[PDB]
Each structure stands twice: as C-alpha cells, then as structure tokens.
Design an enzyme around this catalytic site. Structure first.
Site, PDB file in Angstrom:
ATOM      1  N   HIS A 154      -4.003  36.799  16.273  1.00 52.94           N
ATOM      2  CA  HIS A 154      -2.951  36.327  16.996  1.00 52.94           C
ATOM      3  C   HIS A 154      -3.216  35.091  17.696  1.00 52.94           C
ATOM      4  O   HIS A 154      -4.170  34.588  17.536  1.00 52.94           O
ATOM      5  CB  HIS A 154      -2.855  37.416  18.276  1.00 52.94           C
ATOM      6  CG  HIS A 154      -1.363  37.334  18.820  1.00 52.94           C
ATOM      7  ND1 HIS A 154      -0.767  36.348  19.605  1.00 52.94           N
ATOM      8  CD2 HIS A 154      -0.411  38.539  18.777  1.00 52.94           C
ATOM      9  CE1 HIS A 154       0.396  36.568  20.058  1.00 52.94           C
ATOM     10  NE2 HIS A 154       0.566  37.896  19.546  1.00 52.94           N
ATOM     11  N   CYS A 160       6.061  41.932  20.552  1.00 53.34           N
ATOM     12  CA  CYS A 160       6.227  41.378  19.345  1.00 53.34           C
ATOM     13  C   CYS A 160       5.353  42.068  18.296  1.00 53.34           C
ATOM     14  O   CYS A 160       5.920  42.463  17.123  1.00 53.34           O
ATOM     15  CB  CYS A 160       5.877  39.990  19.337  1.00 53.34           C
ATOM     16  SG  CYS A 160       4.175  39.726  20.386  1.00 53.34           S
TER      17      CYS A 160
END
Lengths: 334, 334, 334, 334
Positions: free
Chosen positions: C178, C151
């Site tokens: 994140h 990702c």
C-alpha cells in the site's frame, strides 16, 4: 507546409520531443533512428511514461513501421550517423539527441545522409546557440548546424534578459535545484570522471558543476563574463528550480521587478516566460510547457540593488517544446 | 591460519564482502581485481558508503597498493579472468562477484591463474549451492567451484527448514518486497529483456520474477517442487522482507510456531536466524548480520493448517557475512 | 434527475469525491462542511493537487460560496454534525468522510439536519456494507445508513467473486503493498496505539494489520471465515497492489483463470474489474477509475489447486468513483 | 561536577539531546516531561531510530523510571510547565524543546517549579541568543532564560564570522536546501498559515521563508541588516546544506578563502567548523557533530569580490551537541 523531422536517438529527450511534436502539431516526425531499441520496445516506451502518464492517442506497429495516430514512421537501427539514409525517408531536419555528437564535425555526418539542417538538443562547443524568445531572431538560414542550448539555460535566459534590459545586471550567481536525470545511479555506482555523480541518487543531495549560466553570456553578449553558478541534484522526478542572486545598476524595488516581469510575461514573452502569485510547489509545474515561471512570493530583496529571484521549469516538457518551436521558426524562415 | 582471499570485481557485493572481512577478521583479503576502477577511486569507493556509513578504520593508497588498516592489497586491472595472476599474489580462495561468470566453465578460468577454490556470490546453473546453517555440512572438500546462492534464498532457507522439520510443509508460495538494486534505472530507461526493470525505480513498484524459492528446493531436497514465488521492488535503500504463505501437514497454532522458531534461533541457528517480538520496521535491520529475522507480531494464521510468516533481511550485509562464514567453514575443512 | 449530495469533511476522500463527481457528472455537489478550512483555502486545495494534477475547469470564491464550473456550493463550518443545516442547502444524500463518525448512531446525526440518506466512505461496525459490482443489487431503499467499505475491499471483492464462482475458493490469504496515506508521519513521530505507524514513512516499509479481507466475507457471505491478510505501507504516492494466495476446489490452469477473468472484465464487470497483459508498473495506474486491474503476467501458479493472483488499484480515484457510482445506483432505486 | 538537566518534551529535539548527552557524557539527564508519551512508549522511542540507528547501550523501564545505561530518569506527564516539580527531581537546568514556550514569560514558568536556568532550543523573540564558537563568551551568568538559536543559524554563524573577520562581508544572501522535518505532511494536508507547508513532502520541493540569516545579525552585531535568505525543503531525511552568496570588501581569491577557512577549522573553531576537500555528498554527514562543514570543491567565485560558499550540517545531531556544549559552558561559568 510543415517541415519533416527525423530524430536520432530514442532516449528521454527524443521521446519527449516526439510527444511534443504530436501534441502540438507544428512539425511532422517521419523517421526515428536507434540501434539498441526494436520496434515493439519502441511502442512500449512511447505508450507508457512514469512522469507524464499514458500517451493520449494510438500507437502501434505495422509492416515494420511505427504508427502513431495513423502516421507511419520509418525506423532505422544504424550506429554510424553517416550511414543513416535520412534522404529517402523524406526527413529535412534532424534532431541530434543522443548526447555524443555535439561538435560541428560529429553532427555534420547527418548531412551526408541527405539531411538539410541539424539541430543539437545539447550544449555545443562550436555550433551557434539559440534560445527561443531571447536571440532566435539572429538565425539567418545560412547556418546548417545549430544548438538549442540546455533546459537550465532556457530557463535562465529570458528572465535575465528582462532584468538586464530594465535594471542593468552588474554581476550575478545562479544556483539550480535539479531533479534526477538518466546519468545518475540508483545506488552508489562507478562514475568515471564525476565521482559525486556515481553516488546513490535516492539518498543524496549531490552538488554538481554546470555551464548554463556561462552559456547565457554566449546567448546574451552583453552579459559575457558576468554570470556563473552550480547545481544541486535532489531526489525528485521532473521539476527543477533556478535561484539567481544578482546586483543591479539601477535602483529597483521588488514591486517594480514584479511589474516588469508580469508585463514581459504577458505581451512579448507569452508562452515562454510565466508569472504566478499563488502558493505553488514543484509538482504544480508537471507537464508545463513554459521555459520558466517567475515565483513572485518566493523571492526576497535585501535592498534596492541586491536581489534573489526564483523561477520554475519542467526540464523535460518545456525544453522539448522549445526544440519544436525553434524548428518551426527555422522552417518559417526558408 | 586464516585463508587468503582474492575478490574479483569491486561492485556492491565485492566492497561489502571486503568490509565484512575486515570487520569480522575471519579471513584476509590479499588481492582485488577490477578493470574499470583505479586505485584512488577504489579508496574513495571503500571509504564512503551512502547506506552503511563511513568505514571504521584507515584506508589509503601506497606504492600502487590499497592499504586498509595497515594491510596492503594487490590491485589487478585484468579483464580476462584466466590472465589474473592470483597465485603470485598469494590468494588461495577467489570470490567471483562480477555476476557474469556464473557457470562452472566460466568461473573455472580463475583456477588457471593459481587459485585453489572459487566461490560464486550468485545463483549458478550447474555449481553446487550451499546455504550456511542449512546444508553447509554437505561440503566435502573435493568441490572446487561452489555457489553461495542469493540473499533471498539465504533468508528463506533457514525458516523453511525449521517449519518443514517441525510441521511438514506440504506446499507454499513466497512474496518478497525488495529494495532497489544496481540493475534498476533512476528514470524510465532501456532494459533489453526485462521491460519492467527499465522503468523508473523512484516512482514505481515493479513486479519481478525470481528463482530463489525454487532454489530452496535445491538447497533442501525434500522441498523440491513445493515452493515458488515472485518479488516486488519498492523504492527503499537496503532492507527487504520475505512473506511465505504455506500449508502445513501437522496442526500448528501460532504460539507453537513462535516457540519453535525462538528455540531454533537461540541454540542451533544462532546468528543466522533471528527472532523479535518488538514493533520493528525496515530501518531497524540496517547493517544487521542475520540472514533472516522472524517477525512474530507481523504474521497471521487463518487456521491450524494455513499460515503466513514474515521475515526481515539486510540483503547487503547479511549476505556478505554469509560468504565470509562459508569461506571460513571451507578453510576449517581442509 | 440527479441527486443532490453534501460532503462532510474536505480531506483527501472528500476532495477526490468532489473531483470525481464534477468529472463524471452523475451527481451534483451542493454543499461542503468543514470546520477547519475556510473558503479561499478550499479554493487553493481543490485547484492544486500533487498527485492528480491541476483541476480541469474553473474554481473560485464568490459571495461566500465555492463556485466550481459555474456551480455554486454552500460552505458550512459546523463541528457538531447534528447542527449542520443540510435541508435548506437542498442536500438529499450526505457523504460522511471525516473518518470519525462510522457507527450508525454517530452517522445518524446527519439525518436530524434534513438529510435523507448517509453514505459512510469508511468501514463500519454495524452499518450494511456494499461493494459495486458484487452485492450492490442487495440494496433495497429502506436502509438509511450504509457503508461503501474501503479501497482494499473494493479491489479484492470482484476478483474473489469471479474466482469463487468459477473455481470455488476453499481458503485464501491476502497481502497488499500500500502507498502512504495521511495518517502516517513524515519522520519518526508519536502514534498512540499503532507504534509502527508512527515511524518515518519515507524511510521504512512498516507492516500493518487490516480488515478488508475479513470484510470480503461480509460482502460475500459464502466466503465468511475463509479470508484474512495484512499489509505493507511502502514510500510511494498513490497506487497500491493486492496479492491473493488461494487454494481452489476445482482444478484450474492459469490460462483458464486468465480466460475467465478477461471474460468477466469484458461483459459483466466492465469498468469495475480490469485486465491487462502488458508489462505494467504502478504509475501506469495513476488516475485509473477501475476498482481492480488483473495483472496476468505478474501472477504465478504452483499447481492446479494453489495460485497467487496479482491486481492493481488506485486507492484514491477508483474508490471515489465507486462512491459516486453507488450514490447514482441509490438514486436510481427510489 | 556535571550539571543536572531536565528535558521538557520528548520530540525529535528532546530525544536527540538525550542521546547526545548520554553519548558525550558532559551533562546528566535526570528528568523528562511529556504529557502524551508513556514510559514503555518512551523506551520504544529512545531505543529505535530510523535515521541514527539503534541506541548503543541499554534502555528499559523499572519502577516507573526510565533506566538508560543504569541511570534512572524521573518521568513527568504534566501539561502546565508551572506545575512540573523540577526541584525535587534534582534538575538544575531545563531544556525547553516543545516549540510552544519560546518567549521569556512563557519559558519562565519553569523557574517556578524549582529550575535555575532555562535553555530554549528554538529561536526566541526576546531571550538572548547564543551560538557556540561565535558569541558564547558574552554569557555572564546573570541571565536566566537564553536561546540557543536554530540549526541553520548555528551552521551559518561561524562561517560568516571567519569571512567577515578576514575579508569584510559587505552584503550577502543565503539559500539552504533543507531536509524534511516533523511539521511537514506525508501527503497534501491542511496547514493553517503556511499553505505551501501543507503540500506533500515526498513529491515536492516547497520554497519556504526563514529568519536564521537575519538572526545572524543578532548573533554578530556588525552584520546587522546585511544578511537575508530563504529555504527549500527537499524530500531527504536528515542532512541540509547552506548556500551563501556574498560580496566582500577586500579582494580575496578562492585559495585565500580556503586557507583561512582551513586555519579557522583547525585551531580556534575545532569541532564546530569543519573542512573537507573530498568529493562528498549529503549522506557522508549523517550523525556528524559539526555545526558546519565547508565544502571547498563545491563553491565558486565569479571575481575577487563576489563569491558563493557551500557548507554542510546535520540539523539533528550537530545542533543537539551544541545544546549540550552550551549547557556545559554555562555550568563551567558558575
């Protein structure tokens, strides 16, 4: 023949009431009043929501008017409620949602501006209270200032109505695990009267006092003086849960309670009271329009006369949709 | 011969400065001013803290005075800073921590009340800035109104000073991951100028602009116009982290950077700049009194002239202890 | 002529890939393999999601098959990937998403079961990597085992491609904030190799090492050896943000960067790279299908040759939709 | 003449029991067994704690032994409990805290290794249960395998003992708002039997079933079959709260309840049952060694025979200190 609705205040309740009115289409919003929010900031506030996501539609500003889905909305920035010109804006009903005009005398200032009826989206000391699906048939069109109660009362009412009608609640005590609100503080902060409410909302559990269980006795007159409770405010975002511990007059096994609650949720209380048997959690009820959803697997019974029942409610959406539904039933009664 | 300190405002910074002053014993608090907090609420606020725990000592209210560890403190409730009688309370220095009197003219109203010197615990537009361990030797006793900068500047300045003195920072950009503060909103709320700061602090990441890296160039004049950055405000409670990406003039391997940072943290910058090689996380620096702690294992170097350095700082405690240390060094210079 | 897809593993990536495939309709899921999840638990897992809400459609269990929107899906419970009968289930492509078969030899066991091609939804040591919109034209149909990267790489790639093509990235470092994943621990717990990853995810910030910025040099061969970075794992739910600090070869004002990024987001990289100028936060990108969205107002430039750029990405949805898009482009090339 | 204690398992309970034993000094830890944690990782785990902070003392590794405050501790890595050599390590009592050996037959394998007595820090199916301050006088030295019950039972017991002894509990129901544990999942994950426990702990409320209120009837034999309840697991870190709704036989005003609870907390139940009248929240009980603290202001009474009582407990520290206190009382009875 939908009624014209003005909204006083563009807080959480006002924005969610506008969102529910545009999603459902039962009423039409024609005016919004807020003294501290300008037009572009109103566009930004209505378009983006952390909890319920982006608005499904178009929202913009044009000629000093807030255009939502092609519908223009007049914007007022008055502070005195008696100085708002509701009449030339065409608004017939006014939703008072600022939380500071809750008495009949204070909320009656909107009637001087040309409004016909005022609905308070808060508990009121002297205005009559109505909960949809419980006592909303008692409205008789000669009342100008009414109150829709609160989210917790709207969750507890229908549920207690079914249990009282089928088994005869003798007495009970309610506890609600509630999500954070706007009045709480991100970190330890100064709260004037409620010292516990000034502590950090992210780190704490924060017991609090509430009057919704007492207001059920105002909504259901046979249960007057038989219910009381308190609340806990945990660091979640939107969904709250009600836990009612009650003693019954008639014997009732848990399967009979489940059967009568499911039968009530199907026919009479459809859309107001829900019923589930799945292994649900709180985020499964995000943006759910029910007032209360009965959790069959979460409750427990000690014997045939002493039970604890669990129910879920989205304290933001379900309540705003109840305001819209009450306004629609009010408009149908003219 | 400890100096007498008055504190203006009993917010987070004022309470943590009082706690650091009573823990360290370098100065003596003799007066506190706050117009919206009464005496018993002051006792409740100082005794209980969600982040740093209960106060280790005794705090009570006696004869209209706040008694902490047997020491009585005069309480004022004045709103106008020029009307506070600092002189008869015996206060010599005044810590201005309300965040609304940051200019020299606004913070100079405390000098009319009998105060000698005013220390602003905030960035200031025109008052001189001092960071302990970097440029605090430039204080010359003829300055009445000075500013201690901010927590982020206090974290960045010692590390940037060491790296610039050993390797010559050509240019750099800083990013800080910051914990929530008091100005944020528990849920989506109305922020006048900063629209992003009005969103829900529990659910969001919230990029924000800051002037700390630019204020380092005011603190270190050789780095003027060479540093800038921004910040992220994540939903944690107390501890923040600074990430500095810089280009060096001289070649520098990462082991040489670690060696010079450790040597600076041992001798000259002892207690101000820390150093660790363990696998630490943010909650390992809760109630840590260092301005900045260098994380050796978390940083990375692309080549000999382009590095990214990581440092930790408790933005509540370390900063208040720096205010106390600056006040002690100011008192020693008389 | 849509391809038939089997999914190995019903974790977060597998469920979100199935959800994206049923939402978009580009491919057809015909088989799911998981040794530790039974059929009714699969129904419960696919129906309810804490992050992305309830599934819009019907999901049930019939005759040992998982029926989603009227489409039946064969369920396998094999542990050895070479023993799964992909061929008689009709599956042509297989998405390997368990995270433990990432080499070519380990993921090649699916070819013995009758599968034609294997797509690894993870970084791989020796399989070729492809990122949609950057180097997906290099696929040539003679490759059986490929990898879709990660990702973070999918967010950083297109962005770095536009900046490198227009201004010539000389060197750059990346930091990503994140959200929490599945490998983290609710409270302090035992992590074998990564000691920092075993600490409590709710209370901590947790610096971590990553290789997505190095894998960009595998995806873009001109940027080999010019990028590196690290990450921070903050206690949010779904949305992450990438911060890239880079030095440019050609002079570039920030308005020129905004212009070329907007032009790239309109024509060539439509649906992959986004662009916004609003005051957005992280929850505004929940369930957004873009790989990366450029935040124009959040970035900052020190001079014409040293910039920091900010981008957003939903690390769950956008990545799964990229797996579906890569599979569709693979099916079109036969 | 302090007893020698071995600990089986270095999870949360084992580390907190070791920390409480070194803080209090009532017993001596001489051995620790864990098959999946090595020595340096044990040093890292014991030194740093996200919830209770850094350890106040010295901890290191020397000659294959864990040295805490100068005391060396033998480390075993055996998996089979019958193969652990407790005898040559000198351990007399063994705390079984892994949570998988809870029956008498499974926990009796430690007696083959040379241990004298085994204390299970978990509810047990057939071992006798003891709660300190309630029924710990019933221990008679001829029992080899006993169980200390659980944190919730330890909170509810003393409280229910005082109310039953003074007013005669007829029947009651309990609800506990519990902090997240180790068994929960950071995000939606696969839980074999409890489907609700596999959902994301950060985002959810998660009703759950518990047997502590039923185990009170095992601890207090007069209350057998009169108590039951459930629990909610909210996303906080350490502190839980017990909510007991009960019907009394004798009339009792709330001031009489407060008086008898305060009198019990002063003399007989000192250190086990607490009492407060301040406006406390959950983080005020972090690292508190009481089993339960009665919140006088948070409770409510409907009438003289139907009350709801609120109590706080640190489910980590208080429980570990109760294990140490039970072990000390066991050692005094020899």
């Amino acid at each position: 023949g939908k009624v014209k609705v003005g909204v006083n205040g563009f807080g959480r309740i006002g924005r969610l009431v506008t969102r529910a009115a545009f999603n459902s289409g039962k009423v039409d919003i024609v005016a919004i009043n807020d003294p501290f929010i300008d037009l572009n900031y109103m566009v930004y506030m209505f378009q983006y929501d952390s909890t319920h996501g982006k608005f499904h539609g178009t929202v913009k500003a044009e000629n000093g008017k807030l255009v939502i889905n092609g519908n223009p909305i007049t914007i007022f920035q008055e502070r005195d409620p008696s100085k708002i010109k509701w009449g030339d804006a065409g608004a017939e009903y006014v939703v008072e949602s600022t939380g500071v005009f809750t008495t009949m005398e204070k909320a009656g200032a909107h009637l001087q501006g040309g409004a016909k009826r005022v609905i308070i989206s808060a508990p009121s000391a002297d205005a009559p209270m109505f909960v949809m699906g419980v006592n909303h048939e008692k409205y008789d069109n000669s009342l100008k200032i009414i109150s829709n109660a609160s989210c917790t009362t709207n969750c507890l009412a229908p549920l207690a109505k079914v249990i009282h009608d089928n088994f005869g609640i003798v007495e009970g005590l309610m506890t609600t695990v509630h999500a954070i609100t706007a009045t709480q503080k991100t970190v330890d902060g100064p709260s004037g009267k409620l010292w516990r409410d000034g502590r950090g909302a992210l780190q704490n559990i924060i017991p609090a006092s509430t009057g919704a269980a007492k207001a059920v006795g105002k909504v259901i007159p046979e249960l007057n003086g038989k219910l009381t409770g308190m609340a806990f405010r945990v660091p979640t975002a939107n969904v709250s849960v009600v836990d009612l511990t009650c003693r019954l007059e008639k014997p009732a096994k848990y399967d009979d309670i489940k059967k009568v609650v499911k039968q009530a949720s199907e026919g009479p209380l459809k859309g107001i009271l829900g019923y589930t048997e799945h292994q649900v959690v709180s985020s499964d009820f995000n943006s759910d329009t029910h007032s209360s959803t009965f959790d069959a697997g979460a409750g427990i019974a000690l014997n045939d006369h002493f039970v604890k029942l669990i129910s879920w409610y989205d304290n933001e959406f379900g309540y705003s949709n109840r305001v819209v539904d009450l306004m629609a039933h009010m408009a149908s009664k003219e």
